[PDB]
Amino acid sequence: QGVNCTEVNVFQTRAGCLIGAEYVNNSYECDIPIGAGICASYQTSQSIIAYTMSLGAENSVAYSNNSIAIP
Amino acid sequence: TNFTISVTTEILPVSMTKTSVDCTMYICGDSTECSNLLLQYGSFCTQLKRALTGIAVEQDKNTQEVFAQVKQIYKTPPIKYFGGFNFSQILPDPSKPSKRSPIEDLLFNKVTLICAQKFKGLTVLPPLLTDEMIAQYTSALLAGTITSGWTFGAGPALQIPFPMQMAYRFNGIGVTQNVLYENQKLIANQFNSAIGKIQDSLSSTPSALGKLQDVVNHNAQALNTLVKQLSSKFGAISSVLNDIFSRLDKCEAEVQIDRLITGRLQSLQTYVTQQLIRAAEIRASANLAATKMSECVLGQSKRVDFCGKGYHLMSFPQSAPHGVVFLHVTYVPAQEKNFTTAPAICHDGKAHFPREGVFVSNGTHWFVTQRNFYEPQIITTDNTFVSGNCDVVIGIVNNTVYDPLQPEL
Amino acid sequence: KQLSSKFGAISSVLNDIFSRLDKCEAEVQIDRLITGRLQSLQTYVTQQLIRAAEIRASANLAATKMSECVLGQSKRVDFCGKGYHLMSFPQSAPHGVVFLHVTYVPAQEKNFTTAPAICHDGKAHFPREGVFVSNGTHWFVTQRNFYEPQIITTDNTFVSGNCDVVIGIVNNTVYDPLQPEL
Ligand SMILES: *[C@@H]1O[C@H](CO)[C@@H](O[C@@H]2O[C@H](CO)[C@@H](O)[C@H](O)[C@H]2NC(C)=O)[C@H](O)[C@H]1NC(C)=O
Ligand SMILES: *[C@@H]1O[C@H](CO)[C@@H](O[C@@H]2O[C@H](CO)[C@@H](O)[C@H](O)[C@H]2NC(C)=O)[C@H](O)[C@H]1NC(C)=O
Ligand SMILES: *[C@@H]1O[C@H](CO)[C@@H](O[C@@H]2O[C@H](CO)[C@@H](O)[C@H](O)[C@H]2NC(C)=O)[C@H](O)[C@H]1NC(C)=O
Ligand SMILES: *[C@@H]1O[C@H](CO)[C@@H](O[C@@H]2O[C@H](CO)[C@@H](O)[C@H](O)[C@H]2NC(C)=O)[C@H](O)[C@H]1NC(C)=O
Ligand SMILES: *[C@@H]1O[C@H](CO)[C@@H](O[C@@H]2O[C@H](CO)[C@@H](O)[C@H](O)[C@H]2NC(C)=O)[C@H](O)[C@H]1NC(C)=O
Ligand SMILES: *[C@@H]1O[C@H](CO)[C@@H](O[C@@H]2O[C@H](CO)[C@@H](O)[C@H](O)[C@H]2NC(C)=O)[C@H](O)[C@H]1NC(C)=O
Ligand SMILES: *[C@@H]1O[C@H](CO)[C@@H](O)[C@H](O)[C@H]1NC(C)=O
Ligand SMILES: *[C@@H]1O[C@H](CO)[C@@H](O)[C@H](O)[C@H]1NC(C)=O
Ligand SMILES: *[C@@H]1O[C@H](CO)[C@@H](O)[C@H](O)[C@H]1NC(C)=O
Ligand SMILES: *[C@@H]1O[C@H](CO)[C@@H](O)[C@H](O)[C@H]1NC(C)=O
Ligand SMILES: *[C@@H]1O[C@H](CO)[C@@H](O)[C@H](O)[C@H]1NC(C)=O
């Protein structure tokens, strides 16, 4: 926390830098918080991985001025 | 007979800075003997670390509760025609380097050494959610409340045009669709004028964003007070452990170290208690803000003076530094007119109570008008129900009614 | 465990200080123990007060939720559960309460073509409850929450003004129940 790895699988973030966890470009629903939009999780062999948060499921709503949808 | 559409801005704090306070570095750094005496002094450090960890967890949960409320992230359409509305002030602008709106770009610019505090065992943990994630959540909420209305708050999002949603909100507050569908351009112009006026008020007056600035100033003052209390002598011979170690031997400095801890740990406990009280106040404010978000952003509330002063229609959430900003769009009527009214009328021996509204007259003829708008309509049997006779009703007046079946005969 | 700490004294128990030290010089040790044991007691009372205030706020929220979801139906969104809440089941829990919120979540959406208003002969017919939707051929009056196809009549539509200022008007006919009588 607050200590760069230069002064000390290596990745750095806003809170600091961490070792032992790799970086994954794909973003899932994380469990263990890390800080500043980063998370940590145990996924597949099995190892601790780090990735950015998924904001949510993507769903684009087609807006029209003359159409409606009723259940 | 008329109305004035105004936008009311409400500022509510959501979270604060997460601060983690070291024990050994704050109390007495680079001192093994002082650390030895400190451990004997007890296990206060574990309790303080647990308290600050719980405070940070509570603030994190508060941020996730207030902001992360939707399961899916919605996207605005590229071309925007919301019935001739100027929504570009609240929509994200791709031309800006950040995804925040120009209103938000004015909002983050109105809210304001760290190395000295960082050296003496005081560290500020960064917030878990960055500003980009909060801006994306705000954009998703705006897209949900604009392109789908309040249907996305309950369950799945159902697309609906913005004038049709506005007519739904008018029917919710009791206003017929005639006012909207006959004065749509006037309503749009009034909304644009209110948006421009509130933007000019936010630009000219910097005192509107006061609560977040007060919280930041209180946190900075508490940190400065903690630093100056570290600078206090606490009745010893010196305020630094290095001078006591250089002058006194350890056995003679035992009493001075004890006198320093008795008072330094007390200042730590006082700071922790003040932080806990401030965290409880922030938690109450964040619960109120989350309730306001869920009951004004995700739907329409009939409660008076909860979603802004006046007849509330909709609220636009805005991202703020360590807080949230609500843009309450309210319906304020104007241009009053005196009238002569009666509570009921009876045509032929039987009273005709109106279903909605009351009977008003301009002096010669009686008409049926709504509660909030002056729409003169002829008295018929469709909007009036018959019950009893006009023998016990106080203030009755004799008048005739129009029967639609009469011209048929 | 804080009772087990020495707190700057030579022992963590008063019996050892009483046995070893005579009372006059052990006055300082007893005073040093009290200054710190009373402080730990005050810290415990303060933490208990903060926890009791948080529990009181949570209990007030739970009582409000019980009174406005169990004793009645609330129109407030996301207060009595996510979705269109109907009625909730109170339940007993150890040092707490459990709410079983029964909500109404619609599904199986279907696209449709809609118009803000329909005028038959020079006069607009705005609907009272529900909106005009069309599957491609004919227009029908269905409510907001459910798709119930009904023929457009004069009972669910009120006449007000003309269709000269309404944006997006469409020309269609209406059913008059008095017409088959003639
Ligand atoms: C609604 O209002 C926005 C103001 O934010 C309009 O955007 C401006 O439009 C004027 C004239 O159309 C341009 O001269 C400006 O350059 C636009 N602003 C920016 C930042 O580019 C928007 O056009 C309006 N929508 C309309 C009129 O349909
Ligand atoms: C109801 O109020 C609106 C706005 O307060 C009035 O609209 C104004 O009308 C004047 C007269 O032509 C114009 O000069 C202004 O530019 C209009 N303002 C806006 C924002 O549209 C409207 O006339 C009022 N209606 C009645 C019946 O009094
Ligand atoms: C009250 O309003 C009614 C409705 O507009 C007025 O009745 C009209 O009056 C004008 C002027 O004499 C006539 O040309 C219309 O034929 C009347 N219409 C109906 C349906 O009767 C009435 O005059 C108004 N009274 C006052 C005192 O202003
Ligand atoms: C409305 O009309 C009724 C009937 O024409 C009026 O009732 C009459 O009132 C007078 C005055 O005391 C009595 O002498 C009659 O016996 C009443 N007739 C009946 C059938 O009740 C009534 O007063 C009128 N009200 C107003 C406000 O003009
Ligand atoms: C739109 O819905 C209407 C009513 O549900 C459909 O009209 C029906 O069509 C069937 C097919 O021949 C007839 O048997 C019924 O008698 C019709 N009912 C009425 C009231 O006209 C219409 O076909 C539908 N259109 C589309 C494109 O699906
Ligand atoms: C509904 O029908 C009316 C009547 O035919 C249409 O009004 C005509 O519109 C055209 C085009 O602007 C004019 O040239 C005629 O003079 C209008 N006639 C009358 C009697 O007003 C109206 O446009 C139709 N609406 C739709 C949506 O089709
Ligand atoms: C660590 O140092 C490198 C080199 O300048 C820098 O790019 C990086 O941002 C630093 N990380 C932190 C957490 O300060
Ligand atoms: C109606 O008349 C009263 C006088 O009795 C006056 O005080 C009031 O202002 C009038 N209402 C309006 C809207 O002018
Ligand atoms: C209103 O009150 C006055 C004063 O008591 C009374 O004279 C008058 O008859 C009342 N009007 C009605 C319609 O009751
Ligand atoms: C309705 O059509 C739009 C495209 O215009 C589409 O995005 C949407 O998913 C459709 N909804 C349903 C329920 O078919
Ligand atoms: C919907 O918007 C498009 C784009 O401006 C426009 O061409 C079309 O006429 C609009 N439809 C209605 C019914 O207003």
CSV table of N, CA, C and O in Angstrom, one decimal, chain B residues 40-42 44 47 51 69 71 81 150-159 161 164 168 171 176-178 181-182 184 255 258 266 269 272-273 276 283 291 294-295 298-300 303 375 382 405 408, chain C residues 2 5-9 32 35-36 39-40 43 46-47 50 53-54 57 75-79 82-84 105-107 109 111 114-116 126-128 131 144 158 160-161 165-167 178 182:
chain,number,residue,atom,x,y,z
B,40,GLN,N,3.6,-3.8,25.5
B,40,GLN,CA,3.3,-4.1,26.9
B,40,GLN,C,2.1,-3.2,27.3
B,40,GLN,O,1.1,-3.7,27.9
B,41,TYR,N,2.1,-1.9,26.9
B,41,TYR,CA,1.0,-1.0,27.2
B,41,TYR,C,-0.3,-1.6,26.9
B,41,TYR,O,-1.3,-1.2,27.4
B,42,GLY,N,-0.3,-2.6,26.0
B,42,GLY,CA,-1.6,-3.2,25.7
B,42,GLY,C,-1.8,-3.5,24.2
B,42,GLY,O,-0.8,-3.4,23.4
B,44,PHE,N,-4.1,-1.8,22.1
B,44,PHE,CA,-4.9,-0.7,21.5
B,44,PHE,C,-4.8,-0.6,20.0
B,44,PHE,O,-5.8,-0.3,19.4
B,47,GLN,N,-7.3,-2.9,18.1
B,47,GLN,CA,-8.6,-2.4,18.2
B,47,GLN,C,-8.8,-1.2,17.3
B,47,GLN,O,-9.8,-1.0,16.6
B,51,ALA,N,-11.2,-0.9,14.0
B,51,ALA,CA,-12.2,0.2,13.9
B,51,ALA,C,-12.1,0.9,12.6
B,51,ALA,O,-13.1,1.2,11.9
B,69,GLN,N,-26.5,0.5,-8.2
B,69,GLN,CA,-27.9,0.1,-7.9
B,69,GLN,C,-28.6,-0.6,-9.1
B,69,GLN,O,-29.6,-1.3,-8.8
B,71,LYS,N,-28.5,-3.4,-12.3
B,71,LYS,CA,-27.8,-4.7,-12.6
B,71,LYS,C,-27.2,-4.6,-14.0
B,71,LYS,O,-26.1,-5.2,-14.2
B,81,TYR,N,-33.2,12.8,-30.2
B,81,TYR,CA,-34.4,13.7,-30.4
B,81,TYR,C,-35.4,13.3,-29.4
B,81,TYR,O,-36.3,12.5,-29.6
B,150,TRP,N,-39.3,4.9,-15.6
B,150,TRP,CA,-39.1,4.2,-14.3
B,150,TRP,C,-39.3,2.7,-14.4
B,150,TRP,O,-39.3,2.1,-13.3
B,151,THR,N,-39.5,2.2,-15.6
B,151,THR,CA,-39.8,0.7,-15.7
B,151,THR,C,-38.5,-0.1,-15.4
B,151,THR,O,-38.6,-1.2,-15.0
B,152,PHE,N,-37.3,0.5,-15.7
B,152,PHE,CA,-36.1,-0.2,-15.5
B,152,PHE,C,-35.7,-0.3,-14.0
B,152,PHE,O,-34.9,-1.2,-13.6
B,153,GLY,N,-36.3,0.6,-13.1
B,153,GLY,CA,-36.0,0.5,-11.7
B,153,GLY,C,-36.6,-0.7,-11.1
B,153,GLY,O,-36.0,-1.4,-10.2
B,154,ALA,N,-37.9,-1.1,-11.5
B,154,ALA,CA,-38.6,-2.2,-10.9
B,154,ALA,C,-38.0,-3.5,-11.5
B,154,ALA,O,-37.6,-4.4,-10.8
B,155,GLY,N,-38.1,-3.7,-12.8
B,155,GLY,CA,-37.7,-4.9,-13.5
B,155,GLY,C,-36.9,-4.6,-14.8
B,155,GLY,O,-36.0,-3.7,-14.8
B,156,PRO,N,-37.2,-5.3,-15.8
B,156,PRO,CA,-36.6,-5.0,-17.1
B,156,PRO,C,-37.0,-3.7,-17.7
B,156,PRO,O,-38.1,-3.2,-17.5
B,157,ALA,N,-36.1,-3.1,-18.5
B,157,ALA,CA,-36.3,-1.8,-19.1
B,157,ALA,C,-37.2,-1.9,-20.3
B,157,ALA,O,-37.1,-2.8,-21.2
B,158,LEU,N,-38.2,-1.1,-20.3
B,158,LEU,CA,-39.2,-1.0,-21.4
B,158,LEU,C,-39.0,0.4,-22.1
B,158,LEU,O,-39.2,1.4,-21.4
B,159,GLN,N,-38.7,0.4,-23.4
B,159,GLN,CA,-38.5,1.7,-24.1
B,159,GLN,C,-39.8,2.4,-24.3
B,159,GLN,O,-40.9,1.8,-24.5
B,161,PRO,N,-41.2,6.7,-25.5
B,161,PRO,CA,-40.8,8.1,-25.8
B,161,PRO,C,-40.9,9.0,-24.6
B,161,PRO,O,-41.7,8.8,-23.7
B,164,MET,N,-44.2,10.7,-23.9
B,164,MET,CA,-45.1,9.7,-23.4
B,164,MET,C,-44.8,9.4,-21.9
B,164,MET,O,-45.8,9.3,-21.1
B,168,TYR,N,-47.1,10.2,-18.7
B,168,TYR,CA,-47.3,9.3,-17.6
B,168,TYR,C,-47.1,9.9,-16.2
B,168,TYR,O,-47.8,9.7,-15.3
B,171,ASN,N,-50.0,12.2,-15.5
B,171,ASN,CA,-51.2,11.4,-15.0
B,171,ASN,C,-50.9,10.8,-13.6
B,171,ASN,O,-51.9,10.6,-12.8
B,176,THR,N,-53.9,16.1,-16.6
B,176,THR,CA,-54.3,15.4,-17.9
B,176,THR,C,-53.2,15.7,-19.0
B,176,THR,O,-52.4,16.6,-18.9
B,177,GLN,N,-53.3,14.8,-20.0
B,177,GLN,CA,-52.4,14.9,-21.1
B,177,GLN,C,-52.6,16.1,-22.0
B,177,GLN,O,-51.8,16.3,-22.9
B,178,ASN,N,-53.8,16.8,-21.9
B,178,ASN,CA,-54.1,17.9,-22.7
B,178,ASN,C,-53.1,19.0,-22.6
B,178,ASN,O,-52.7,19.7,-23.5
B,181,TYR,N,-49.8,17.9,-24.3
B,181,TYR,CA,-49.9,17.7,-25.7
B,181,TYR,C,-50.4,19.0,-26.4
B,181,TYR,O,-50.4,19.0,-27.7
B,182,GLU,N,-50.8,20.0,-25.7
B,182,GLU,CA,-51.1,21.3,-26.3
B,182,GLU,C,-50.0,22.4,-26.0
B,182,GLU,O,-50.0,23.4,-26.7
B,184,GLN,N,-46.4,21.5,-25.5
B,184,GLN,CA,-45.2,20.8,-25.4
B,184,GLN,C,-44.0,21.7,-25.7
B,184,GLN,O,-43.0,21.6,-25.0
B,255,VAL,N,9.4,6.6,32.7
B,255,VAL,CA,8.3,7.4,33.2
B,255,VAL,C,7.9,8.4,32.1
B,255,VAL,O,6.7,8.7,31.9
B,258,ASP,N,6.0,6.5,29.4
B,258,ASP,CA,4.7,6.2,29.9
B,258,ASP,C,3.8,7.4,29.9
B,258,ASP,O,2.6,7.3,29.5
B,266,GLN,N,-4.5,8.4,24.0
B,266,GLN,CA,-5.8,9.1,24.3
B,266,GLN,C,-6.2,10.0,23.1
B,266,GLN,O,-7.4,10.0,22.7
B,269,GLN,N,-7.4,7.6,20.4
B,269,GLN,CA,-8.8,7.2,20.7
B,269,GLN,C,-9.8,8.3,20.5
B,269,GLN,O,-10.9,8.0,20.0
B,272,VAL,N,-10.2,8.5,16.7
B,272,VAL,CA,-11.0,7.3,16.3
B,272,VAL,C,-12.5,7.6,16.6
B,272,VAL,O,-13.4,7.3,15.8
B,273,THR,N,-12.8,8.1,17.8
B,273,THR,CA,-14.2,8.3,18.2
B,273,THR,C,-14.8,9.4,17.3
B,273,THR,O,-16.0,9.3,16.9
B,276,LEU,N,-15.5,7.9,14.0
B,276,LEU,CA,-16.7,7.1,14.1
B,276,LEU,C,-18.0,7.9,14.1
B,276,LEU,O,-19.0,7.5,13.4
B,283,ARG,N,-23.0,7.9,7.2
B,283,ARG,CA,-23.9,6.7,6.9
B,283,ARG,C,-25.3,7.1,6.9
B,283,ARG,O,-26.1,6.6,6.0
B,291,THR,N,-32.1,6.4,-0.4
B,291,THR,CA,-33.5,6.3,-0.4
B,291,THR,C,-34.1,7.4,-1.4
B,291,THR,O,-35.0,7.1,-2.2
B,294,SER,N,-33.5,5.9,-4.9
B,294,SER,CA,-34.4,4.9,-5.3
B,294,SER,C,-35.8,5.3,-5.4
B,294,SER,O,-36.6,4.7,-6.1
B,295,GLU,N,-36.2,6.4,-4.8
B,295,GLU,CA,-37.6,6.9,-4.8
B,295,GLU,C,-37.8,8.1,-5.6
B,295,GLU,O,-39.0,8.6,-5.7
B,298,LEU,N,-35.5,6.2,-9.6
B,298,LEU,CA,-36.1,5.0,-10.1
B,298,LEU,C,-37.6,5.0,-10.2
B,298,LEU,O,-38.2,4.0,-10.6
B,299,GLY,N,-38.2,6.1,-9.8
B,299,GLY,CA,-39.7,6.1,-9.8
B,299,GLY,C,-40.2,7.5,-9.4
B,299,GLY,O,-39.4,8.4,-9.1
B,300,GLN,N,-41.5,7.6,-9.4
B,300,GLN,CA,-42.1,8.9,-9.0
B,300,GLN,C,-42.7,8.7,-7.6
B,300,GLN,O,-43.5,7.8,-7.4
B,303,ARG,N,-44.8,11.7,-2.1
B,303,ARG,CA,-44.5,12.3,-0.9
B,303,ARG,C,-44.1,13.8,-1.1
B,303,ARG,O,-43.4,14.1,-2.0
B,375,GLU,N,-59.2,24.0,-17.1
B,375,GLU,CA,-59.8,23.5,-18.3
B,375,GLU,C,-61.3,23.6,-18.3
B,375,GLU,O,-61.9,22.7,-17.7
B,382,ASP,N,-71.2,12.2,-17.6
B,382,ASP,CA,-70.1,11.3,-17.6
B,382,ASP,C,-69.1,11.5,-16.5
B,382,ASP,O,-68.6,10.6,-15.9
B,405,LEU,N,-77.6,12.1,-24.5
B,405,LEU,CA,-78.6,11.4,-25.2
B,405,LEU,C,-79.8,12.3,-25.6
B,405,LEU,O,-80.6,11.8,-26.4
B,408,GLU,N,-80.1,13.1,-29.4
B,408,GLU,CA,-80.4,11.9,-30.2
B,408,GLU,C,-81.9,11.8,-30.3
B,408,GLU,O,-82.4,11.4,-31.4
C,2,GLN,N,-7.8,-7.3,27.4
C,2,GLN,CA,-7.3,-6.0,27.9
C,2,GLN,C,-7.2,-6.0,29.4
C,2,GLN,O,-6.4,-5.3,30.0
C,5,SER,N,-3.7,-7.3,30.4
C,5,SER,CA,-2.6,-6.5,30.1
C,5,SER,C,-2.0,-5.9,31.4
C,5,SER,O,-2.7,-5.7,32.4
C,6,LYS,N,-0.6,-5.7,31.4
C,6,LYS,CA,0.0,-5.1,32.5
C,6,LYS,C,-0.3,-3.7,32.7
C,6,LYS,O,-0.3,-3.2,33.8
C,7,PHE,N,-0.5,-2.9,31.6
C,7,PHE,CA,-0.9,-1.5,31.6
C,7,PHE,C,0.2,-0.6,32.3
C,7,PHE,O,-0.2,0.3,33.0
C,8,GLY,N,1.4,-0.9,32.0
C,8,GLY,CA,2.5,-0.2,32.6
C,8,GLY,C,2.9,-0.6,34.0
C,8,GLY,O,3.9,0.0,34.5
C,9,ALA,N,2.2,-1.6,34.6
C,9,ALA,CA,2.6,-2.0,35.9
C,9,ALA,C,3.5,-3.2,35.9
C,9,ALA,O,3.7,-3.8,34.8
C,32,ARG,N,-1.8,3.8,38.4
C,32,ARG,CA,-1.4,3.6,37.0
C,32,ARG,C,-2.3,2.5,36.4
C,32,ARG,O,-2.6,2.6,35.2
C,35,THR,N,-5.8,4.4,35.9
C,35,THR,CA,-5.7,5.3,34.7
C,35,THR,C,-5.3,4.4,33.5
C,35,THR,O,-4.1,4.2,33.3
C,36,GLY,N,-6.3,4.0,32.8
C,36,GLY,CA,-6.1,3.0,31.7
C,36,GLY,C,-7.1,1.9,31.8
C,36,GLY,O,-7.7,1.6,30.7
C,39,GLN,N,-10.1,4.0,31.4
C,39,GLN,CA,-10.1,4.4,30.0
C,39,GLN,C,-10.6,3.3,29.0
C,39,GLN,O,-11.3,3.6,28.1
C,40,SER,N,-10.1,2.1,29.3
C,40,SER,CA,-10.6,0.9,28.5
C,40,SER,C,-12.1,0.7,28.7
C,40,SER,O,-12.8,0.4,27.8
C,43,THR,N,-13.8,3.4,26.7
C,43,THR,CA,-13.8,3.1,25.3
C,43,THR,C,-14.8,2.0,24.9
C,43,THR,O,-15.4,2.1,23.9
C,46,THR,N,-18.2,3.6,25.0
C,46,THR,CA,-18.4,4.4,23.8
C,46,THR,C,-18.6,3.6,22.5
C,46,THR,O,-19.5,3.9,21.7
C,47,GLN,N,-17.9,2.5,22.4
C,47,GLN,CA,-18.1,1.5,21.3
C,47,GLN,C,-19.5,0.9,21.4
C,47,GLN,O,-20.2,0.7,20.3
C,50,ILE,N,-22.0,3.5,20.3
C,50,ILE,CA,-22.1,3.7,18.8
C,50,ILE,C,-22.8,2.5,18.2
C,50,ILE,O,-23.6,2.7,17.2
C,53,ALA,N,-26.5,2.9,18.8
C,53,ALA,CA,-27.1,3.9,17.9
C,53,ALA,C,-27.3,3.3,16.5
C,53,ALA,O,-28.3,3.6,15.9
C,54,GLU,N,-26.3,2.6,16.0
C,54,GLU,CA,-26.5,1.9,14.7
C,54,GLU,C,-27.6,0.9,14.7
C,54,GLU,O,-28.4,0.9,13.7
C,57,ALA,N,-30.9,2.8,14.7
C,57,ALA,CA,-31.2,3.3,13.4
C,57,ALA,C,-31.8,2.1,12.5
C,57,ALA,O,-32.7,2.3,11.8
C,75,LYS,N,-46.4,2.6,-2.4
C,75,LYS,CA,-46.1,2.9,-3.8
C,75,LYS,C,-44.6,3.3,-4.0
C,75,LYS,O,-44.2,3.6,-5.1
C,76,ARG,N,-43.8,3.4,-2.9
C,76,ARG,CA,-42.5,3.9,-3.0
C,76,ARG,C,-41.6,2.8,-3.7
C,76,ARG,O,-41.7,1.6,-3.4
C,77,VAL,N,-40.8,3.2,-4.6
C,77,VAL,CA,-40.0,2.3,-5.4
C,77,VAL,C,-38.8,1.8,-4.6
C,77,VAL,O,-38.0,2.6,-4.1
C,78,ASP,N,-38.6,0.5,-4.6
C,78,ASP,CA,-37.4,-0.2,-4.0
C,78,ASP,C,-37.3,0.1,-2.5
C,78,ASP,O,-36.2,0.3,-2.0
C,79,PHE,N,-38.5,0.2,-1.9
C,79,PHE,CA,-38.5,0.3,-0.4
C,79,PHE,C,-39.0,-1.0,0.2
C,79,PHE,O,-38.5,-1.5,1.3
C,82,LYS,N,-37.4,-5.1,-4.5
C,82,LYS,CA,-37.2,-4.7,-5.9
C,82,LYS,C,-38.4,-5.1,-6.7
C,82,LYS,O,-38.8,-6.3,-6.7
C,83,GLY,N,-39.0,-4.2,-7.5
C,83,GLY,CA,-40.2,-4.5,-8.3
C,83,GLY,C,-41.5,-4.0,-7.7
C,83,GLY,O,-41.5,-3.3,-6.7
C,84,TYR,N,-42.6,-4.4,-8.3
C,84,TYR,CA,-43.9,-4.0,-7.9
C,84,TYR,C,-44.3,-4.9,-6.7
C,84,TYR,O,-44.8,-6.0,-6.8
C,105,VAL,N,-42.9,-9.0,-11.1
C,105,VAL,CA,-41.9,-8.7,-12.1
C,105,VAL,C,-42.4,-9.2,-13.5
C,105,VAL,O,-42.6,-10.4,-13.7
C,106,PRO,N,-42.8,-8.2,-14.3
C,106,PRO,CA,-43.2,-8.6,-15.7
C,106,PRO,C,-42.1,-9.1,-16.5
C,106,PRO,O,-40.9,-8.9,-16.3
C,107,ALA,N,-42.5,-9.9,-17.6
C,107,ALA,CA,-41.6,-10.5,-18.5
C,107,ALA,C,-42.3,-10.7,-19.9
C,107,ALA,O,-43.4,-10.3,-20.0
C,109,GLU,N,-41.5,-9.4,-23.2
C,109,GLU,CA,-41.8,-8.2,-23.8
C,109,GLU,C,-42.1,-8.4,-25.3
C,109,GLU,O,-41.8,-9.4,-25.9
C,111,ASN,N,-42.6,-5.9,-29.0
C,111,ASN,CA,-42.6,-4.6,-29.6
C,111,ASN,C,-43.9,-4.2,-30.2
C,111,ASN,O,-44.7,-5.1,-30.7
C,114,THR,N,-46.9,2.8,-31.4
C,114,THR,CA,-47.8,3.6,-30.6
C,114,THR,C,-47.9,5.0,-31.1
C,114,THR,O,-47.0,5.4,-31.9
C,115,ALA,N,-49.0,5.7,-30.7
C,115,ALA,CA,-49.2,7.0,-31.1
C,115,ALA,C,-49.6,7.8,-29.9
C,115,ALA,O,-50.3,7.3,-29.0
C,116,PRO,N,-49.3,9.1,-29.8
C,116,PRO,CA,-49.7,9.9,-28.6
C,116,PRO,C,-51.2,10.1,-28.6
C,116,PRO,O,-51.8,10.2,-27.5
C,126,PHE,N,-58.1,11.5,-26.5
C,126,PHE,CA,-57.0,11.0,-25.6
C,126,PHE,C,-57.6,9.9,-24.6
C,126,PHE,O,-58.7,10.1,-24.1
C,127,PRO,N,-56.8,8.8,-24.5
C,127,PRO,CA,-57.3,7.8,-23.6
C,127,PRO,C,-57.2,8.1,-22.1
C,127,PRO,O,-56.4,9.0,-21.7
C,128,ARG,N,-58.1,7.5,-21.3
C,128,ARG,CA,-58.1,7.7,-19.9
C,128,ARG,C,-57.0,6.9,-19.2
C,128,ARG,O,-56.1,7.5,-18.6
C,131,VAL,N,-52.7,3.2,-23.2
C,131,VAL,CA,-52.2,3.9,-24.4
C,131,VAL,C,-52.6,3.1,-25.6
C,131,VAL,O,-52.9,1.9,-25.6
C,144,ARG,N,-50.9,-0.2,-19.1
C,144,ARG,CA,-49.5,0.0,-19.0
C,144,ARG,C,-48.8,-1.3,-18.6
C,144,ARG,O,-47.7,-1.7,-19.2
C,158,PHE,N,-61.6,10.5,-23.8
C,158,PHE,CA,-62.3,11.7,-23.6
C,158,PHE,C,-61.9,12.7,-24.7
C,158,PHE,O,-60.8,12.7,-25.2
C,160,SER,N,-61.2,16.4,-26.2
C,160,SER,CA,-60.6,17.6,-25.8
C,160,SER,C,-59.9,18.3,-26.9
C,160,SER,O,-58.8,17.7,-27.3
C,161,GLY,N,-60.4,19.4,-27.5
C,161,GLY,CA,-59.7,20.1,-28.5
C,161,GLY,C,-59.7,19.4,-29.8
C,161,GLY,O,-60.4,18.4,-30.1
C,165,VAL,N,-52.4,20.6,-32.9
C,165,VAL,CA,-51.2,20.9,-32.2
C,165,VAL,C,-50.5,19.7,-31.6
C,165,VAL,O,-49.4,19.8,-31.1
C,166,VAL,N,-51.1,18.5,-31.8
C,166,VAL,CA,-50.6,17.3,-31.3
C,166,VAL,C,-49.5,16.8,-32.3
C,166,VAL,O,-49.8,16.6,-33.4
C,167,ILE,N,-48.3,16.5,-31.8
C,167,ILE,CA,-47.2,16.0,-32.6
C,167,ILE,C,-47.3,14.5,-32.7
C,167,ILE,O,-47.5,13.8,-31.8
C,178,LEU,N,-73.5,3.5,-29.3
C,178,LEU,CA,-74.8,3.9,-29.7
C,178,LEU,C,-75.1,3.7,-31.2
C,178,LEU,O,-76.2,3.7,-31.6
C,182,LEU,N,-78.9,2.5,-33.7
C,182,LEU,CA,-79.6,3.2,-34.8
C,182,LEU,C,-79.8,2.3,-36.0
C,182,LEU,O,-80.7,1.5,-36.1
